[PDB]
């Protein structure tokens, strides 16, 4: 059924800036119940978002259908979550703490998007 | 692959466990607001 990279959490890039909570839930919720959505709100993060699905199959389905899907006047980039990629802008050293914190406390994978 | 099939089955399942807000917070870098 599903490869090692597939995850419940999706990473979204190239979001329209003026997108409402409603619209997010509308777009992504179509594929199954949503655990939550975080939305980039600082200069370095505007336009990106993380949507968390309650079920990994829903996530897998949404990622298939939405990657490169046009909304407003832009093609969405959607990728599976990855702890390493998500913590890139962390200074090379302080990365390790969180990366290892996660792998230890919550057992979720730390490996780079290979 | 009776052992491969179980194992995959078991992998997909750990990746499908309920998640605490607390679990989730440690998942994300700064600069994001929860909708």
From Swiss-Prot, chain A:
| InterPro entries reported in the protein's UniProt record | Nucleotide-bd_a/b_plait_sf (IPR012677), RBD_domain_sf (IPR035979), RRM_dom (IPR000504), RRT5_SRSF_SR (IPR050374), SF3B6_RRM (IPR034150)
Residues covered by the RRM domain: 8-83
Q: Which GO terms describe its biological process?
A: blastocyst formation; mRNA splicing, via spliceosome; U2-type prespliceosome assembly
* Residues recorded with modification N6-acetyllysine: 18, 30
Q: How does it assemble?
A: Component of the 17S U2 SnRNP complex, a ribonucleoprotein complex that contains small nuclear RNA (snRNA) U2 and a number of specific proteins. Part of the SF3B subcomplex of the 17S U2 SnRNP complex. SF3B associates with the splicing subcomplex SF3A and a 12S RNA unit to form the U2 small nuclear ribonucleoproteins complex (U2 snRNP). Within the SF3B complex interacts directly with SF3B1. Component of the minor spliceosome, which splices U12-type introns.
State the protein's name: Splicing factor 3B subunit 6
- Species for this entry: Homo sapiens
What the record says about family reads: Belongs to the SF3B6 family.
Name the Gene3D superfamilies on file.
3.30.70.330
Q: What taxonomic lineage is listed for the species of origin? A: Eukaryota, Metazoa, Chordata, Craniata, Vertebrata
* Pfam families to which the protein is assigned, alphabetical: RRM_1 (PF00076)
Curated annotation (Swiss-Prot), chain B:
Localization (cell): Nucleus; Nucleus speckle
Give the domain of life.
Answer: Eukaryota
Which positions are linked by Glycyl lysine isopeptide (Lys-Gly) (interchain with G-Cter in SUMO1)?
A: 33
Say where the cross-link Glycyl lysine isopeptide (Lys-Gly) (interchain with G-Cter in SUMO2) occurs: 33
Which residues carry the post-translational modification Phosphoserine, per the record? Answer: 20
PTM summary: Phosphorylated. Phosphorylation occurs concomitantly with the splicing catalytic steps.
What is this protein's function?
A: Component of the 17S U2 SnRNP complex of the spliceosome, a large ribonucleoprotein complex that removes introns from transcribed pre-mRNAs. The 17S U2 SnRNP complex (1) directly participates in early spliceosome assembly and (2) mediates recognition of the intron branch site during pre-mRNA splicing by promoting the selection of the pre-mRNA branch-site adenosine, the nucleophile for the first step of splicing.
What subunit structure does UniProt give? Component of the 17S U2 SnRNP complex, a ribonucleoprotein complex that contains small nuclear RNA (snRNA) U2 and a number of specific proteins. Part of the SF3B subcomplex of the 17S U2 SnRNP complex. SF3B associates with the splicing subcomplex SF3A and a 12S RNA unit to form the U2 small nuclear ribonucleoproteins complex (U2 snRNP). Within the SF3B complex, interacts directly (via HEAT domain) with SF3B3, SF3B5, SF3B6 and (via HEAT domain) with PHF5A. The SF3B subcomplex interacts with U2AF2. Identified in the spliceosome C complex.
Q: Which family does it belong to?
A: Belongs to the SF3B1 family.
Q: What is this protein called?
A: Splicing factor 3B subunit 1
Species assigned in the record: Homo sapiens
């Amino acid at each position: 059924r599903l490869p090692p990279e597939v995850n419940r959490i999706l990473m979204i890039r190239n979001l329209p800036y003026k997108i409402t909570a409603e619209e997010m839930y509308d777009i992504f919720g179509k594929y199954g119940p949503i655990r939550q959505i975080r939305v980039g709100n600082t200069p370095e993060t505007r336009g990106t978002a993380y949507v968390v699905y309650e079920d990994i199959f829903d996530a897998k389905n949404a990622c298939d259908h939405l990657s490169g899907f046009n909304v407003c006047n832009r093609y969405l980039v959607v990728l599976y979550y990855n702890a390493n990629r998500a913590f890139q802008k962390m200074d090379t050293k302080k990365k390790e703490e969180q990366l290892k914190l996660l792998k230890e406390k919550y057992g979720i994978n730390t490996d780079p998007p290979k | 692959e009776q052992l491969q099939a179980w194992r995959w089955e078991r992998e997909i399942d750990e990746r499908n466990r309920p998640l605490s807000d607390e679990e989730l917070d440690a998942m994300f870098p700064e600069g994001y607001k929860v909708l």
